[PDB]
Amino acid sequence: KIWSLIRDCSGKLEGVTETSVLEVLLIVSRVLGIRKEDLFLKDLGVSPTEEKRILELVEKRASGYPLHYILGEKEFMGLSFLVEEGVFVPRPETEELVELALELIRKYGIKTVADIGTGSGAIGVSVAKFSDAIVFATDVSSKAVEIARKNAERHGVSDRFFVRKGEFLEPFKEKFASIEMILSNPPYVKSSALFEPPEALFGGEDGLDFYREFFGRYDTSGKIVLMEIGEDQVEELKKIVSDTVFLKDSAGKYRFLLLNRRSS
Numbered sequence: 001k002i003w004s005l006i007r008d009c010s011g012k013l014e015g016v017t018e019t020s021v022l023e024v025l026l027i028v029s030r031v032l033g034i035r036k037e038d039l040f041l042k043d044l045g046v047s048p049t050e051e052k053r054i055l056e057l058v059e060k061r062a063s064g065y066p067l068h069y070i071l072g073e074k075e076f077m078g079l080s081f082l083v084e085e086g087v088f089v090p091r092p093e094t095e096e097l098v099e100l101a102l103e104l105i106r107k108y109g110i111k112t113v114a115d116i117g118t119g120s121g122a123i124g125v126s127v128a129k130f131s132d133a134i135v136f137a138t139d140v141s142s143k144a145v146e147i148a149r150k151n152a153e154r155h156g157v158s159d160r161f162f163v164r165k166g167e168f169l170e171p172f173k174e175k176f177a178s179i180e181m182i183l184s185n186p187p188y189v190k191s192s193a194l195f196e197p198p199e200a201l202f203g204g205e206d207g208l209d210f211y212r213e214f215f216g217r218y219d220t221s222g223k224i225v226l227m228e229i230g231e232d233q234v235e236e237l238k239k240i241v242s243d244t245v246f247l248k249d250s251a252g253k254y255r256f257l258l259l260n261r262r263s264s
């Protein structure tokens, strides 16, 4: 059977994953070359090369290597984002930033938006696909820039999502002024601490370098700045940026900084 294979592949993963069966289900679909809902048909056996690939990938995973890198894909705001080693894998917590972002575009009629450190493009691509905004996106990784460009093509929004390599908004200076809302899910981990990129997790000794450099260099008058943040960085953020508000996600951990300097 392939349902035994499935059940043995998973015990192998009551390590790294809490959701071993589902991760097995997904690794199986991907080798068999199939949509996940096809696993249920009859005449669904898995023939060698196949069974071969599955324990292969299955153990590459018991190790802690990322599922989504194996899968080549991660769903975020209901969309399929291509991901590969070198790109940060979108996290569920971040969908919250986007829905808050969307509520903001509707509330104000915002038309131009930026997404600092785009990664796979999860934030800006979703904002583009689900609103009328135009989005300027940046990443220091040329590998993120690439994948993000394709995810934009992949979702029909290359005409409203532009990514440029470089840091912060340095590559879009010509556009700084016209930008109404600045979005980011930047590195915020105490570097005073895994297969995702360092550039993407680490925020210096205290995990704030990113905000210190940003609110330090950019004049934000007239703009709405919405950024994801570490659970424990509120009190210290209140001193780099004094007029910000701070929201909790669906869980109750503070997760977002909102600095609304739009007017009237």
Ligand SMILES: Nc1ncnc2c1ncn2[C@@H]1O[C@H](CSCC[C@H](N)C(=O)O)[C@@H](O)[C@H]1O
Pocket: 088, 089, 090, 091, 094, 116, 117, 118, 119, 120, 121, 122, 123, 138, 139, 140, 141, 144, 166, 167, 168, 184, 185, 186, 187, 199, 200, 201, 210
């Ligand atoms: N100063 C900086 N300017 C622009 N991008 C930066 C940067 N510092 C880190 N990055 C980028 O920030 C991203 C952080 S990970 C988050 C990626 C994506 N926004 C998501 O939410 O899934 C990485 O892709 C990294 O390349």
